[PDB]
Assembly symmetry: C7
Homo-oligomer: 287 residues x 7
């Protein structure tokens, strides 16, 4: 059994989950690191300075106007001056969104690690016996359990619910703030405050990234809905039933009565692991 031992690793992750993970979590991290690399290659703020100022006072003006980040208008008190804090706060939101989106994929394993592996191992061992009524009675008990169905459905729906947060915040940022210049007003005269106008060269790129992320995240939300409806309603085929050719009449009406059956979920992992069963081709040609 050296060959079996060397290839004893069993796939426990459907390709659809991998596609969803790649399309949802991995790409935003790459975009965030690209934005960070671009942002740490230039000075943060560029703006003007009167003639009388020395170098140190100019440095203080730049630092203060970057730290405060508050606009000003003529004839209006400071109680109504607009702010631009999210222009500086944006990337950390995406950094947190990556993890909050990744949580469910890690959550599923802690519940599906062992039981599914044991059941799959037992079924694959049993397939050898049927090549030539312990198994017949097993389907009756196993086919009325709906624990796996009640868990697989829960994982997918939670992704849809958690997707309302990132889209809502990005949608209200893309079409709300377009300002790029403001009149910073530092108040101090330790020899009538002076006024400067400053520019933010960190906005023409973050605008584009916030637009691509909306489209990419919305497509993944739609593709989940179409697969879920088709899977549990329209599909009336089971892989295990086709390759067995010996099923009792007592299991006929049960299968088309309710689709919330354990054997429905178990049918996929056997299909995706058809390599490990060596009697598939020989048995298929018999019929």
């Amino acid at each position: 059994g050296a060959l079996a031992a060397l290839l004893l690793q069993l796939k426990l992750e459907l390709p659809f989950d991998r596609v969803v993970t790649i399309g949802t979590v991995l790409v935003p991290i790459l975009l965030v690191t690209l934005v960070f690399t671009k942002n740490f290659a230039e000075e943060p703020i560029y703006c003007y300075t009167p003639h009388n100022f020395t170098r140190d006072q100019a440095l203080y003006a730049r630092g203060y106007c970057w730290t405060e980040l508050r606009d000003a208008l003529p004839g209006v008190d400071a109680s109504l001056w607009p702010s631009l804090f999210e222009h500086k706060f944006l990337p950390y939101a995406l950094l947190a969104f990556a993890a909050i989106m990744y949580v469910p994929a890690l959550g599923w394993e802690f519940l599906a690690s062992t039981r599914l592996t044991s059941e799959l191992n037992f079924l694959l061992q049993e397939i050898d016996n049927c090549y030539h009524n312990l198994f017949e009675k097993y389907l009756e008990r196993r086919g009325r359990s709906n624990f796996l169905a009640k868990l697989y459905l829960a994982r997918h729906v939670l992704i849809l619910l958690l997707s309302a947060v990132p889209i809502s915040y990005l949608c209200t940022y893309y079409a709300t703030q377009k300002q790029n210049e403001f009149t910073c007003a530092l108040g101090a005269s330790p020899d009538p405050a002076v006024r400067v106008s400053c520019k933010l060269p960190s906005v023409q790129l973050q605008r584009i990234i916030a637009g691509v992320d909306i489209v990419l995240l919305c497509v993944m939300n739609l593709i989940i809905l179409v697969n879920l409806i088709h899977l549990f309603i329209f599909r009336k085929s089971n892989f295990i039933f086709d390759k067995l050719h010996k099923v009792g009449i007592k299991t006929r009406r049960q299968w088309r009565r309710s689709q919330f059956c354990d054997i429905n979920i178990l049918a996929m992992f056997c299909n995706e692991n058809r390599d490990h069963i060596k009697s598939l081709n020989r048995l298929d040609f018999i019929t």
Copy 2:
């Protein structure tokens, strides 16, 4: 036994412990490293300088006002000037809190490494024999021991007690330190001391981090309490008893008389390692 030897590793850590560790220790390290990366990308302090000063005197003024970090008020002596030391000392507190929270996880292993492994190995070896009165007398002696219960309870209750320190310090920091500008007063005239006002651009981000960490640490404190009560009081089921179908009358009343039973802790570990026993499915279908 090549297949068994290749997979001879036995799980020893419960999933709940892993969840608690991830939710308690790992995240604050990431937040601290993010804060450090942000903080080491700018100057420490920006502030003003009179016209007569040269460059070196301005540099000395900046350094002295950063090092002293003391406020000033008119008409008040130096004996009552407020300080702002937390704004400089904050991150190391979190750095120490990470380790002081991580200690119990290391402490558990040094006491539970070997005995639990040996007992589990003996039990899993015995399960083969019961498929077809050493075990009958074994439960009488083993069921009256309470060493594991007296240790598992101690590990969880210690986390709750140690959680009073980090929360108490962070709560009083959130609602007390709100100042951002002060009038530093350096006293020296080696040709009536001059006065400058300085700004700290390292406070608008540390405020937010100190708020998220409170909520995250408080939720994990509550989730521990609910699980402890349910496991040791309300749950009246043992995994080993259900899959054996052979229990003496004498051991029946001892099970519900007290809950501090050694078999109770052993029951959970066997459930999470049900893969290693190959007679589970065959024996379950018998009943």
Copy 3:
């Protein structure tokens, strides 16, 4: 079976796919990283400054004229001033093009991982028996399937369709914009706006890279078309039929009627994996 177990890995990617991948995806990444390395070794913009300006105002002028990146002309309002944004936006387009071109290679595996491996394993196991009528009837069912053919054609035809985007954008950039100098006009006089003329030293190299990429990507588009026509139309030879020497007359007219047959794709993989069969040389010399 230690020797077989050690060399249990089976080749799954055809050499043509590897050649296409190397010629399409890998090289643009190297060109992009070379461009980035060259571009991050100098200042972004070089230009002039009047005599009255101090240092800080000159720095502000440089930064503002780099950020705006807008031309100016005499006697024309600002509503018709040309822009040069792609000179700054170019490399990220190639960075995205690399991945959007690489997608189909990753897409192929998720569908061709298991079934092809199982079929190849069964055929290689069986080929020992033919050395000395399940196989005779096997070609009847297998030879009328066309799933693999309907998938292999889809992968190649999708590369050609996706090649219209990168070619169109690069073609309209190489021979449209050749400007290198412009008269930036910053408007502010907080003591009649001053005017400066600036130079972009990041255009003489990106022009050459955009030319080589056009030729390299166009050649791979042509080489795919010639191979597709030859493989499915002109080639009238099958590897298995040549080395079997026992085929019924029923499979003769079927093979010469339609080329959209499943064994045609399976023939190539067996030929490239002729090492794993040890009866090839002995059987070939028999005829």
Copy 4:
């Protein structure tokens, strides 16, 4: 014996030694590296400069006042000026203290590597035989050797003696130096020496580190003393004697006549390696 060969690594380090090492050696290295990281993020010394000085003379003044590091007072000659050298020399003392504390742990292995392993292997091999008078006479000779006891006691007592150096120096430093400003007086007039006052921004953090290390190192000194007395005086139980159930009366008097017995040290090692013996549970239930 593949399973035995794969797990042939026998534990040789007691958990108490690991706890002492972690509590004594590892933590000071982390504190030292934290101090170094903090210290290499700022200029070494900040201080003032008269108006007539140019830039180069100011740089020389800073460097000279940092290098000399000597105080000054009015009306007192240079023969009585206080110094502050250890403020600069502190971290290397801790760096050396780490290694000088770590020496004994490395020293013990070179003497305890082989003999203990050989005797433990012999005992573990023999335990199989006793399941069903070489061993009876073996304890007579082995029980009268005190080499291991004479070595284990020496290792622990040496740690206590070596702990007088690091505590004495740190304790006498925490409460002798609170100065932070001094009046550096550089003497040179290459056109009545000028005087400047300088500040050291590397003292408010090294004070706290030198306080924590005192408490942490002192607690580990106390915990060693309590364990040594309990193990060699109060404890009147041997693991090997309890699990044998076949012992002679001749060894009874020698058991509590003297505690410097070889089997006493071997008793702990067998207890912590109870996994490697498979007859423990079966033999224990017999009594």
Copy 5:
């Protein structure tokens, strides 16, 4: 067969190919990286500046005269001003020329990875049979094939053809351009253009590297020609025919008629893998 399995790797690359690769491809990469390391340790251009210029105008002058890289002469219009472009472009051309020459090594592997290693196993296996007429007729069919000869010849001749590009370009660069100074003329007067003379300190080292690479690449071109003629024409010896001692007269005339035989190429590979056959020494001493 553990010893055979452990040493199952078969050499499939003649030493001559390794020598050619090392002498042709590897060295230019080292020279290019040395040139890059030297060139990225100094400023690109040094030159003069009039007295009235400030710092920013001098920086613009340096940058503009580096970017334009155009000479100037008195009394001649700008349409005939000589250029010095390739002084900035040489290293990238060297990298491209070092990377292009790697195609044949990859092509040979792609075209002969499998067939040679599949065919050689039969010859290595049959040695046991010949120790004590399948092989007699085997050489008749195998000795009349010329596919391998038609491929080995193509690989070597293709190296010679692609070697005419690097030699032609480097030869016309070593003895054409020796200029080192020029009179850059920037035209702009935002208050009769000023004139400066600039120096390129990146030409005295690239001259030497372009000379060594000519000699090294030319020698490898000659050594290939002499080996090709000797192997296919003058050499009248076959390794297999010397170690078999049983060949028919039919195979005699054909071997000396045409040298374009598959057995000729297979002779060298068997000679370099004489270790894997253990009957060589015993059979050799028989004759």
Copy 6:
């Protein structure tokens, strides 16, 4: 023999050699790297500059006074001016001393790699036979060879001889070079040479390192001498003779007639590898 194969590694290095290596070679490398890290964290030389000097002339003065490193005195010609080259040349001396001290340890292996291993393997194989007159006559021939003794003695004495160089140079450096200030005199007047006084802030730490290294290297010299005398003169016990209990009278008087015996060296190696013989404990209890 899987267990023997897994642990087939035989120790071929006495612990004393490891202790000497750690105490002699490893520590100076750590001290040198610490000195280098300290030395590359500050400017090399600090000193004064007259008022009329500009920045570039001050930089030239610093560079010249650092390069020349020559003192000056009033009324004395340049032929008698003292030098201070050691303060700049010191670390490379230690860097070379490390290797010149490490040479013998590498040298011994090239001569003791194979013969000792083979003879030890033969002896360990033989020990099995003696459990139940080839060996009786073996000691007669083996006991009259002194090759191993003539080599082990030579390795240790060469260490003592090579220790005269590093100690002699360091001792004369500690008590001779104490200067820290000098009056550099650069001679040039391209408008009576000016004079400056410079300070070297790289001497207060290299003095302490040169003191610790003297004590550490001297103690290791003494510990070698005491062990050499004890091993070859006072010790009158052999491990192989004690555990054999069967030696002829002919081998008795030759044992203490001369101590330059091969079995004397082999006695130590067998003792350190007592684990590999499993009959030690059983045979020892027999007597």
Copy 7:
């Protein structure tokens, strides 16, 4: 044969070759990297500057005088001005010398890889048979081959011939150029050329390195000559003949007639691989 398979690696490199390589090739690389590390930690050239020069012209002057690197003298035209190019060109010469010296060691393997291993394996296999006339006649044929002798001599003599280049260039550099100052004369007056005096602080260390390399390389040249004469002329002993005790009278005078025997080279290799033969000690004691 698991033990033999695990230790199937046969030594092929003689210790003398390893000593020559480590003494010739490895050390110069370390010296070159030390020189590079020293040279890349300071400014390249320190040079003076008149009072009227601005900052940018001073920056130009240093670079121009460093690039030209040409001396000047009064009353002599530029046609006879000495140069100092090797002061800048030195390290690359050593970098190339390392590789040109390393070539032969890599060259020898491509010719000695296979046949030596095959012959050694056959002989070691044969040694088993002689423990109890194919081998008798083998020495007659093998003893008259001189291919290995004609190759081993060629490898060593080529090292001596290639040693004439590095020594000749270094000897003519140590005692030819000792200049350290020169009067650079930049000619340009774009408002009678000015003159400055420069300095090269990269000469006092390259002088010492060029002195050590002469001695180290010359000693290794002498040690090769003495070993070559002793091995092939004076030594009249063969290891294989001593341990066989069975040589014909025909084989006696041939060995003492000519020393260019293939068995002579093979004898040394067997001596260093005496571990792999287990009958060495048993056979040696027989005589």
